[PDB]
């Protein structure tokens, strides 16, 4: 066959059926979605790397990730993001 | 084998359609050649780095992924072709 | 004697893959040492970000009475949210178009 | 008498028409010829994916339509309605190229 | 300590001085208010970024190196402060 | 009769002066007071290194002066010599903020 | 018993530290491994840029007859070279100021 | 008792000497040069990391370094820069 | 137990033969004693001059679409720079010819 | 086989592959190159002997031939060649 190629199609498709069970996707739109995921992912990853370099910490942790999303994502979207992410932290710490 | 003039291949009505999508309702006659010039500049700046990306990959066929890298380095990042 | 193979995304209760992004940060070269909770954090952030943009897109698709999402609706949704436009002002969408916009002096009397 | 609209009304109609539509404005084969032409100016004999050419043409049209909306803002700011190349030169100088 | 009206602490002739550095030949009297507003927006953004940096740093004191980082991530890099 | 220059001549003189000079055109104490006042709004009881304050001083002066040649280009672009707030609004919106 | 100590900057024959740049790139986390010639090459291109910009600094200083440099002269040097301006459009120098520049319509007559 | 803060000051002062033995230096301009070399260093380093990530190379090599040199530096600066870099890496290769 | 035979041309990091130039000075009958740094200095200046004249050879070859140098390229390179002309005013290049140069009074109206 | 005729061909070949890897060589222009290198060598070596004579100095060193190249070859190329020569004598001083 062919070597496996990663995509974010199935996860966004679960997100869609959570948010709108009725609708479908175009593949062009899903290409934009994959580009969006990778772009925001690398932006926050670069923030994570630079902030970890700045305070001379050999680890990356979530604390600077709240720092990163609060600096990068503006305002109420960022504070919403803090809300779901920290509660996701609570479920992950409770396993 | 070689080509010498295709900047006129971007015709005036295509520029007019772009200007209508730009919201221009009235276009001077002097617009078209200088828009061709700035298009020339922007395409040079992107394709120089694009073929630079390609030649570092030791490829003689370009990839669209490298075009994505060229535009995102230039600050005009594109969605819809990564992957 | 091994326990059941359970997934960390379900442990957070979210849908983005924890292990995939954990591997991505391990190979993306942003730190040599990675904490456990940060990939969970970012996965939740991105999944929510998809949630509001998909809500805006689906509402736009319902407004334009199409039941399968199209890039035009993505452009119209993102350019109509102020904070996402501040997030995404410098990005270009393939086959997207722009907002319907005419200036007042361009309109006739 | 054959009908003829007053000027600008039809122009506003293409503004509405191509602003509602997204489909691409330029003939793709001449611009393919042009990108091959300008690519040969750096290095000889490049091959192109059609995906790459279409991707770069969305990027190009986005850049152009951005600078047209800037020169719209400039020309309206100049109490005029017609764009002239000094307005575009102003916009290009303001953006910082 | 706690103050109220420091937007007017940037005086009008100081704004005239910046404008003459900008090469402005004639300044309207209306100008000083929106220059205060634009300065307000810009400083608000960059100092929000800076306080975010230092609250990550577990420092109660503002450092210049954080200001350097905050300016350069916004695309307005400065030199001369150890960056 | 006492000497009195025509308008613009004096202004051109300090234009040449402040183009020649590099010193900071904002008084330091109310500026840093404004910085402390606004920084109070996001978190309480902040202390400032002085060099940070002077750094963000020239950052502010550079941002304003940059949008000032933007404003000047807009003003001469509209065949005027006096700037108006919509010039600055235009310049910022072209820069995209 | 052991070779005499001689630095890698001497081997490159250039003044920027090969060892410090090597160490900074190893702990700057840009790849898992680093090639030998890459930090040397990086230091060389840096010192070339410093060479030309201090040439501009020096002759701009002799324009003002000052043997010690001022950052004003640095801003003059950056703004009077078009490629260095293109490198440095979005960065401003502390106490840098602006070029002597007047619009022609602002002049009398 | 103190702990060091490094800079590029000695190298800038030396290269100032062999470009022009008879001229001086101000300290704040010398810090500007410090931060300038730091900024160019970080730009090249990040671009190099990105190129190494693109071609899935886990090792960074001088080939993509000079590729990035053309990528960032425009024209004249780029071609002379690759010239000294090439002749320098040949001297190191002989060394 | 001898160290490896390594060359002074490599020690000066230059292409021109330091040893042969030293030998040609020694039997060129200019002094009975000669310093070590002098042939290195000569190697340096002759590298730089041959380098600049070869850059001129390269672009004078390239703009006439030739990938192999000709003495016409050499003549057009040298005679178009006044400083090498003051270096080489009394110098003739074989098959070099002259610059394309017509006096203005010789041209018709 | 015939006895060796020493010439300066291969060195100019090497320096051109630093300055232009692509471009080729005609042999009569190559003899012209040998004529430049020999002639300028002759001028500078004779001036070096002469300047050693006038200061009554027995030894040809770098400083008087620096003096001589400042004499004969003019201006910008002279001061640049001074720069590479100082660089070369310093790095050769470091062996």
Numbering used by the authors:
A (entry chain D), H (entry chain H), J (entry chain N): 30 to 124
B (entry chain F), E (entry chain B): 20 to 102
C (entry chain C), G (entry chain G), I (entry chain M): 10 to 118
D (entry chain E), F (entry chain A): 37 to 133
Reproduce, without paraphrasing, sentences from the article in which this PDB structure was first reported.
The structures show a zig-zag arrangement of nucleosomes, with nucleosomes 1 and 3 forming a stack. H1 binding to stacked nucleosomes depends on the NRL, whereas H1 always binds to the non-stacked nucleosomes 2 and 4.
In our structures, we observe a compact stacking of nucleosomes 1 and 3 that is similar to type I interactions with a contact formed between H2A–H2B dimers. H1 is absent from the stacked nucleosomes of the 4×177 array, but is present on nucleosome 1 in the 4×187 and 4×197 arrays, and is present on both stacked nucleosomes in the 4×207 array. To confirm that our observations are not a result of low salt concentrations, we solved the trinucleosome core structure of the H1-bound 4×177 array at 60 mM NaCl and confirmed the presence of nucleosome stacks and the absence of H1 on stacking nucleosomes.
